[PDB]
Amino acid sequence: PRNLRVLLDTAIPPSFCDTVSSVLLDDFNMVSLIRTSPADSLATIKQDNAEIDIAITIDEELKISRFNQCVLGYTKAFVVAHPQHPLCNAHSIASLANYRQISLGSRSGQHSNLLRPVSDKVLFVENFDDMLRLVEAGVGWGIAPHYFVEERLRNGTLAVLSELYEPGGIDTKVYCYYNTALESERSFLRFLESARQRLRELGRQ
Amino acid sequence: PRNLRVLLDTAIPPSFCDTVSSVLLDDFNMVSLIRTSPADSLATIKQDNAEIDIAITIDEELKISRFNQCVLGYTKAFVVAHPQHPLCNAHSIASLANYRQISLGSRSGQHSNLLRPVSDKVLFVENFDDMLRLVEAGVGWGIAPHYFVEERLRNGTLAVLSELYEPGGIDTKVYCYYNTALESERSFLRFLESARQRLRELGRQ
Ligand SMILES: Fc1ccc(C#CCNc2ccnc(C(F)(F)F)c2)cc1
Numbered sequence: 001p002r003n004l005r006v007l008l009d010t011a012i013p014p015s016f017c018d019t020v021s022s023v024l025l026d027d028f029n030m031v032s033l034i035r036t037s038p039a040d041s042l043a044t045i046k047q048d049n050a051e052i053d054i055a056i057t058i059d060e061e062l063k064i065s066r067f068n069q070c071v072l073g074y075t076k077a078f079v080v081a082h083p084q085h086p087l088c089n090a091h092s093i094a095s096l097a098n099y100r101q102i103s104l105g106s107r108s109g110q111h112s113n114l115l116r117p118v119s120d121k122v123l124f125v126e127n128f129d130d131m132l133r134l135v136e137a138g139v140g141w142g143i144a145p146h147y148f149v150e151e152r153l154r155n156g157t158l159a160v161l162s163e164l165y166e167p168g169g170i171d172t173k174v175y176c177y178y179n180t181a182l183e184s185e186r187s188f189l190r191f192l193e194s195a196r197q198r199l200r201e202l203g204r205q
Numbered sequence: 206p207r208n209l210r211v212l213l214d215t216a217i218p219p220s221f222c223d224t225v226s227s228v229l230l231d232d233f234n235m236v237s238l239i240r241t242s243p244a245d246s247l248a249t250i251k252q253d254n255a256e257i258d259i260a261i262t263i264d265e266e267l268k269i270s271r272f273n274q275c276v277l278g279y280t281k282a283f284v285v286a287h288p289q290h291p292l293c294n295a296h297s298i299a300s301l302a303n304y305r306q307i308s309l310g311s312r313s314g315q316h317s318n319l320l321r322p323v324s325d326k327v328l329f330v331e332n333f334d335d336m337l338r339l340v341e342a343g344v345g346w347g348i349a350p351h352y353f354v355e356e357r358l359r360n361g362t363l364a365v366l367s368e369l370y371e372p373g374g375i376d377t378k379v380y381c382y383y384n385t386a387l388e389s390e391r392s393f394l395r396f397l398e399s400a401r402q403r404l405r406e407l408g409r410q
């Protein structure tokens with residue numbers, strides 16, 4: 001035993017996990033890293049069989065039995081669309097409720113408040129890569145993490161629709177859920193401090 | 206006609222409203238300022254009779270007919286309790302679900318995710334003053350805005366319980382809901398820029 005299993009959703013930057021990997025490797029037998037869609041994180045850890053000890057995700061649930069919650073920091077996500085998508089005036093949310101958007105589907109078909117689509121023209125996809133395939137094809141708009149659309153936004157391939165809603169990008173809170181057996185661990189607090197400093201650093205890029 | 210009615214919940218600092226008062230006074234016949242509990246803001250504007258044109262509140266609702274939503278910035282709120290309240294070790298949320306807290310009741314008895322109490326020992330109050338009466342009396346803990354508990358926290362009269370949950374204070378997003386008739390107003394955009402800069406300034410204090 002003593003095998004730590006950590007879950008990160010694909011809204012967390014890959015660079016972030018470096019800290020996870022460096023800090024708590026030494027304090028456990030074996031550290032395992034798993035990535036899921038933000039829409040599958042909570043449902044994944046709520047499978048007892050899955051034996052997830054730590055989850056780092058933007059999804060929010062009030063009380064998930066046998067898990068505590070704490071905040072690690074913030075990330076950025078933008079509403080993006082094809083640069084010639086009808087809505088590129090930025091009215092903003094008013095219009096979005098009526099056009100197609102590629103939003104992250106879930107294996108359970110249900111969604112939280114944070115991630116439930118806003119429109120009724122909705123096309124579910126499993127991952128951000130498919131989302132942005134369809135979005136770069138004019139099929140609809142979509143909400144995606146910063147690090148996914150950085151390249152494309154500065155290359156004209158994509159346009160931001162959410163500067164009136166929240167200038168600078170939709171700041172999304174990043175939560176850490178974890179086993180009630182870890183509060184009594186020195187490691188875990190070292191990890192929390194390091195992860196918080198790390199998100200704080202990534203925010204400055 | 207042309208009487209602007211603006212609503213602010215008591216989680217927004219009073220100083221903030223100064224900008225509101227200065228910026229849009231000149232562009233309307235008459236500007237009226239109304240303050241409500243964060244738990245009464247949305248329900249208040251959803252009364253058609255109330256004729257609210259702008260609401261500035263931390264409460265969140267996905268879609269409220271005849272109103273658009275946008276983000277103005279962030280404020281801070283802390284979980285506070287009597288300095289000798291049992292829980293002053295800061296376990297954190299784990300324990301809070303089982304002790305009494307004075308949380309903001311609503312006139313409708315229903316609550317959003319953001320504001321629905323966490324415990325089952327719950328004592329509803331109408332306003333933050335009553336909340337902190339009972340909290341300074343050891344009766345329970347409570348979530349209150351920064352500017353309410355600043356004085357008391359630096360004077361030992363109060364203690365913070367939520368530094369492990371989110372060090373620095375629970376950052377709460379501040380929304381602005383407004384009439385679909387105001388998107389077509391120059392005033393409103395001036396107000397948005399000014400209000401956003403204002404919350405950004407207040408964050409630095
Ligand atoms: F017009 C809109 C549409 C959506 C939002 C929002 C929000 C909450 N934040 C997220 C949601 C969905 N997805 C992500 C992320 F996975 F990309 F991070 C982050 C704001 C204005």
Ligand SMILES: Fc1ccc(C#CCNc2ccnc(C(F)(F)F)c2)cc1
Binds near residue numbers: 263282284319323375
């Ligand atoms: F253990 C806890 C308990 C509650 C929270 C939270 C939250 C959301 N933010 C607010 C909620 C209720 N009230 C306010 C305010 F009105 F004071 F701003 C702000 C975090 C950890």
